């Protein structure tokens, strides 16, 4: 095997790793690093090339090409540099200092997220998904753990990460956290942009109620809830949620994918229409 990207010797010459570990999976690690020349902070993701007895270098290349195609979208994480060694490919990514949006879905921090904030974050997520779909890209893993924030105090902007499952529209299809799988995946139907819209419905549900819409006592119950779309819209859970927000969710969590609205249509939903009160509004009647 011959290596393609920059050598490991150059990496240790230009960067130094810090003690802040950001994430760890079974075939990947994310750790903060700093440039020796400028002092800027970055996030370095180490990806193993061999997995489950299979060579996956080609798949990593495909993921890099997707990041490159969306370089000009502010809602998608930026790729700075790439390095390679015997067993790993290393991605130098923009650093999101705010962490996962999943932190805002817990009953602990629920007291600091206003309606204006939720409206803004959803809007920004739709802007990134619309950009991807316009290029025939489907993320297929829009969990709250893969949607980050640039800042937390105050609240920053959205950054989407983790493109390991990206595909073109029409590719054939059953793994991942069961509670986030769309009904068409459990039925082995082809891939469609509507799948990402189903996941957007879950994000909004979790931000507004701080509960999971489909998780059950075990995996068997979770699958029944999904295939039957059994969701809790009770008084107790929605006492402080507006009707327009409820309408937004109920139009996305529908069994038939052909009935879900597109990203472009979602951006025109009445729940997201808001006027910045610091601007001078010009009515329809002139002087
Ligand atoms: N650019 C980043 N800035 C800050 N934290 C990050 C960044 N990228 C990933 N992380 C953190 O590392 C975790 C794992 O990253 P991810 O790309 O989702 O890899 P995996 O395939 O193991 O899920 C994320 O959940 C997030 O908390
Ligand atoms: Cl490491
Ligand atoms: Mg991930």
Numbering used by the authors: 18 to 190, 195 to 308
How does the study describe this entry?
Crystals are grown by sitting-drop vapor diffusion and previously established crystallization conditions can be directly applied. As a consequence, ‘naked’ crystals are obtained on the chip, resulting in very low background scattering levels and making the crystals highly accessible for external manipulation such as the application of ligand solutions. Serial diffraction experiments carried out at cryogenic temperatures at a synchrotron and at room temperature at an X-ray free-electron laser yielded high-quality X-ray structures of the human membrane protein aquaporin 2 and two new ligand-bound structures of thermolysin and the human kinase DRAK2.
DRAK2 crystals were grown by batch crystallization and were soaked on a Roadrunner I chip for 1 h with the natural ligand ATP using the on-chip crystallization chamber. The suitability of our on-chip crystallization system for on-chip ligand-binding studies is demonstrated by the structure solution of two protein–ligand complexes that are new to the Protein Data Bank: thermolysin in complex with aspartate and the human kinase DRAK2 in complex with Mg2+-ADP.
